[PDB]
């Protein structure tokens, strides 16, 4: 009864991230990006089938379909063999050049029409799994296509795999750049609705600190989309470090994520990277305690109280256990990072180990998931940005009626308030 981590790339950015993540899973497992796994992957504890399912030619085929709203994302991915580990059907680029039209309403329409296609692809890619967790939707909420497809295909995939999960990832637009089309609000609304309705966790990405990291920390000033794709590949390799490869604890890394996702309404988590462009447990905590030092903009807003209740970090790296206990005690008791303010004296932090071929910038490569009402405040900001196409009528989910977008913005604000209550001992 082995396990495999499935995914699905949606949108142009989503499919670029999907190809980069297939390459990253291959590399971290030890599979060459050209579509063949080197024999060095077998020696390590990194299980290719967990992240980039090795083909008969050792092609570490990710259990994901590379579908792009802009088909040019995968049209030129054929020349680059970085997605050759995936099966030809595994690179399932969307036929439409506009995909779902970069409109949140059309995105929901396309995801629901692809419901049969999404369910069929899930069934086709579910063969390689014995004790897996579920599929994902590696998409981008920047254009409404990505977020609408995320929500609609999430409903469709929940229909196809009810006992499993299909985690939608709403990679919203660049928070440092204004969008040309203002229909993204219904996209953020649909993503927040998919989060709060059933999914215990949901992904929301803000590019405010991320743009600064890319321009200066990553030094990619005025870069192309490749910088974002490379960052997505690095994050996927970091996740495969704890999923595909053996660490030191937290056999249920998904269980830890579900612990930080204790409620469908509180579906927001804060990511933290340290370094993000020599780390004792305390040093790593000092290097990533602040949301700014973190890799995700868990909103420091008031709709959700920007107090991190619980944290769980994939700190890939083997620190000493005495130091780990001392740093956990310092966080818990010394109020450096206390437990959920709704809980007694405890620590809310985790750690991981890197993949067989995945390195760490410090003693522990940081990629966190902090169940924080600051992340809920980021969701609140997304809810406030979810009315741009409804209140101002800017630019199915919104075209057929604004019920989806407006109710989703209201639900996002309500979840922000609920997480504001849950950052402190008044969660109820």
């Amino acid at each position: 009864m082995p396990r495999e981590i499935i995914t699905l790339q949606l949108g142009q950015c989503g499919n670029q991230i999907g190809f980069e993540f297939w390459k990253q899973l291959c590399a971290e497992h030890g599979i060459s990006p050209e579509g063949i796994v080197e024999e060095f992957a077998t020696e390590g504890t990194d299980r290719k089938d967990v992240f980039f399912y090795q083909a008969d030619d050792e092609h570490y085929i990710p259990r994901a379909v590379l579908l792009d709203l802009e088909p040019r994302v995968i049209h030129s991915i054929l020349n680059s063999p970085y997605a050759k580990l995936y099966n030809p059907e595994n690179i399932y680029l969307s036929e439409h050049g506009g995909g779902a039209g970069n409109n949140w309403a059309s995105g929901f329409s396309q995801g629901e029409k692809i419901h049969e296609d999404i369910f069929d692809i899930i069934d086709r890619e579910a063969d390689g799994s014995d004790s897996l967790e579920g599929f994902v939707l590696c998409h981008s909420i920047a254009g409404g296509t990505g977020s609408g497809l995320g929500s609609y295909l999430l409903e469709r995939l929940n229909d196809r795999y009810p006992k499993k999960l299909v985690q939608t990832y709403s990679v919203f637009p660049n928070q440092d750049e204004m969008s040309d089309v203002v229909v993204q609000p219904y996209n953020s609304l649909l993503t927040l609705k998919r989060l709060t309705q059933n999914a215990d966790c949901v992904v929301v990405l803000d590019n405010t600190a991320l743009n600064r990291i890319a321009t200066d920390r990553l030094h990619i000033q005025n870069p192309s989309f490749s910088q974002i794709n490379q960052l997505v590949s690095t994050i996927m390799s970091a996740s495969t470090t704890t999923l595909r490869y053996p660490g030191y604890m937290n056999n249920d890394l998904i269980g830890l994520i579900a612990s930080l996702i204790p409620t469908p309404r509180l579906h927001f988590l804060m990511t933290g990277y340290t370094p993000l462009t020599k780390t004792t447990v305390l040093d790593v905590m000092r290097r990533l305690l602040q949301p700014k030092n973190v890799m995700v903009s868990t909103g420091r807003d008031r709709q959700t109280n920007h107090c991190y209740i619980a944290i769980l970090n994939i700190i890939q790296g083997e620190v000493d256990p005495t130091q780990v206990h001392k740093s956990l005690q310092r966080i818990r008791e010394r109020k450096l990072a206390n437990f959920i303010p709704w809980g007694p004296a405890s620590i809310q932090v985790a750690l991981s180990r890197k993949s067989p071929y995945l390195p760490s910038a410090h003693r522990v490569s940081g990629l966190m998931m902090a169940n924080h009402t600051s992340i809920s405040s980021l969701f609140e900001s997304s809810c406030q940005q979810y009315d741009k196409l409804r209140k101002r009528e800017a630019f199915d989910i919104f075209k057929e009626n604004f019920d989806e977008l407006d109710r989703s913005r209201e639900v996002v604000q309500e979840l922000i308030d609920e997480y504001h209550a849950a950052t402190r001992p008044d969660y109820i």
Partner: protein
């Protein structure tokens, strides 16, 4: 003569291989096996299929083989040699108290005459460690089933209460053996066979095993602590069943009792060591 005999017994007699495979299977070394169990396998016996059905020989043997196969660490010969022993036959499987599944006891195998230094203490300690691991796994699988039933389709803070309850248990298990105690226990058993007589080598091995058990604070005077933990675990199992159904009161009481019993256990630990 004593040194030569000890070296011959300790070099490649598979006796320490028995202990290694016990720590690999009786204690589930491969996280894949535990994850597969809590995801798909921990369905029937987790709540208790039946007093007679859950004790079926062929089904239990198939389940053990499947758990060993799901992990590329339970392939050790003594991993499959982990056998079944019992003191009380199955009687009830109500998923209200912590009685989820604690019937099976893992018993690995060693070489002979490596049992020259075999006393009842070390085997009893190993069996008790396996039983405690089984009970903790039953609680964790009840929580996992609660989460799965909640996700299949008045219940807030249930996952937070589960994490708060599990933190201390995880800390104790890591103290017993995580990465440092994981080698300290091995080093203690590495000095288990250094005597000129089998009785003294047995004493060294039993001392290492007892120190490993004492790492978890397994003192026999802690029967009241066992009762308090039993009440807490009954509440935990009831809350897991309630969360599988859709309790919020159980979760809030779990958090409050976690704080209170943490204070009580801190006082007890200060009073004892």
């Amino acid at each position: 003569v004593n040194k030569a005999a000890v070296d011959y017994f300790f070099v490649e007699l598979h006796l320490g291989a028995h202990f290694e495979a016990l720590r690999h299977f009786l204690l589930m070394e491969d996280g894949e096996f535990a994850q597969s169990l809590s995801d798909l396998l921990f369905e029937k016996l987790g709540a208790g299929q039946t007093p007679g059905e859950l004790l079926s020989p062929l089904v239990l043997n198939s389940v053990l083989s499947k758990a060993l196969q799901y992990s590329l660490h339970g392939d050790t010969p003594h991993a499959a040699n982990l056998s079944f022993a019992l003191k009380f036959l199955p009687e009830a499987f109500a998923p209200n108290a912590p009685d989820v599944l604690s019937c099976l006891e893992l018993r690995y195998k060693v070489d002979w005459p490596l049992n020259i230094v075999v006393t009842e203490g070390c085997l009893s300690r190993y069996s008790g460690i396996f039983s405690f691991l089984l009970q903790l796994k039953l609680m964790m699988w009840t929580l996992k089933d609660v989460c799965f039933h909640l996700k299949r389709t008045q219940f807030r803070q249930l996952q937070l209460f589960k994490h708060e309850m599990q933190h201390f248990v995880k800390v104790i298990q890591g103290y017993i053996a995580n990465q440092i105690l994981h080698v300290t226990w091995c080093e203690f058993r590495a000095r288990l066979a250094s005597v000129g007589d089998l009785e003294e080598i047995q004493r060294a091995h039993a001392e290492y095993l007892h120190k490993a058990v004492f790492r978890g604070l397994l003192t026999e005077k802690a029967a009241p602590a066992m009762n308090i933990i039993h009440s807490l675990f009954s509440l935990v199992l009831k809350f897991r069943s309630q969360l599988i159904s859709q309790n919020f009161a159980l979760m809030q009481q779990s958090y409050s009792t976690f704080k209170y019993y943490s204070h009580f256990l801190f006082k007890v630990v200060s009073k004892l060591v």
